[PDB]
Design a protein around this ligand. Structure first.
Ligand code: HEM
Ligand code: NA
Length: 250
């Protein structure tokens, strides 16, 4: 009951479904689901509840936001998706990029995240600096996910499982390597690798390691490493909330 979703026309809903189908095909055919999940997450994760600025309002299309250091490489994702967007002028960029994130999780075998249309494309990007610093720890994660976005500790650990997909690139973030041996498969391998420690061929960031030493985050790591179904359930709920920060709040 925290949300009151807006009414959109049948044509809008039809466009969402047709765009979803095109996105499912492109994301699978181009093997770019991890990048598209990162696109949706960096679009949404800038929300600060105290000012109601940032969030999933289409601003990743804005070159000034693409130029943020944390968004290096997301210009590639925007350009890859633009041919589909051109076929769906009725849709907001805000909805379109969140739909791409939901599709990225689906096509890699993850949970089916509900999707509710109607986000507006806002004119101003957030200030740079809202997203998490990979070199910091649990206090910082709580400032970013909790104080800014309004999400719970469970949400932090579940969403960190997005690193089950993809990898870091030296020219984008400056880190280099994948968290998992199967980076196109949405599963609980991220948490299993965290628990087994550093090892040749795989990466862990300081922010990942902070989940192991924190007394509230660690039981959640243990749970998700042991129980993929529980991870999928909590991930679905957290991704839904993330994708709707500042949107349709009652
Ligand atoms: C918890 C704090 C987080 C930190 C510090 C963080 C940091 C990073 C960094 C440094 C990269 C590498 C970017 C590059 O070099 O290409 C990355 C990639 C990625 N992030 Fe996170 N991230 C966080 C949370 C999340 C969340 C919440 C999600 C989604 C639910 C997510 C999904 C991804 C994905 C899928 C990639 C790989 C992209 C690719 O393969 O191109 N991350 N993250
Ligand atoms: Na994986």
């Amino acid at each position: 009951m925290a949300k009151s979703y807006p009414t959109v026309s049948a044509e809008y809903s039809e466009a969402v479904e047709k765009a979803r189908q095109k996105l499912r095909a492109l994301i699978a055919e181009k093997s770019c689901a991890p990048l598209m999940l990162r696109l949706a997450w960096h679009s949404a994760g800038t929300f600060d509840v105290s000012s109601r600025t940032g969030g999933p309002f289409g601003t990743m299309k804005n070159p000034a936001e693409l130029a943020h250091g944390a968004n290096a490489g997301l210009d590639i994702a925007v350009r890859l998706l633009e041919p589909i967007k051109e076929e769906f002028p009725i849709l907001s960029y805000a909805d379109f990029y969140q739909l791409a994130g939901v599709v990225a999780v689906e096509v890699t075998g993850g949970p089916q995240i509900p999707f509710h249309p109607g986000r507006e494309d806002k004119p101003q990007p957030p200030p740079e600096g809202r997203l998490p610093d990979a070199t910091k720890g649990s206090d910082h994660l709580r400032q970013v996910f909790g104080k800014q976005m309004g999400l719970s500790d469970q949400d932090i650990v579940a969403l960190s499982g997005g690193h089950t997909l993809g990898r870091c690139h030296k020219e984008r973030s400056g880190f280099e390597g994948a968290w998992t041996s199967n980076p196109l498969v949405f599963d609980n391998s991220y948490f299993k690798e965290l628990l087994s420690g550093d090892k040749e061929g795989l990466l862990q960031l300081p922010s990942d390691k902070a989940l192991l030493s924190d007394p509230a985050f660690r039981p959640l790591v243990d749970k998700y490493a042991a129980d993929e179904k529980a991870f999928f359930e909590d991930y679905k709920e957290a991704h839904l909330k993330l994708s709707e920060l500042g949107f349709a709040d009652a």
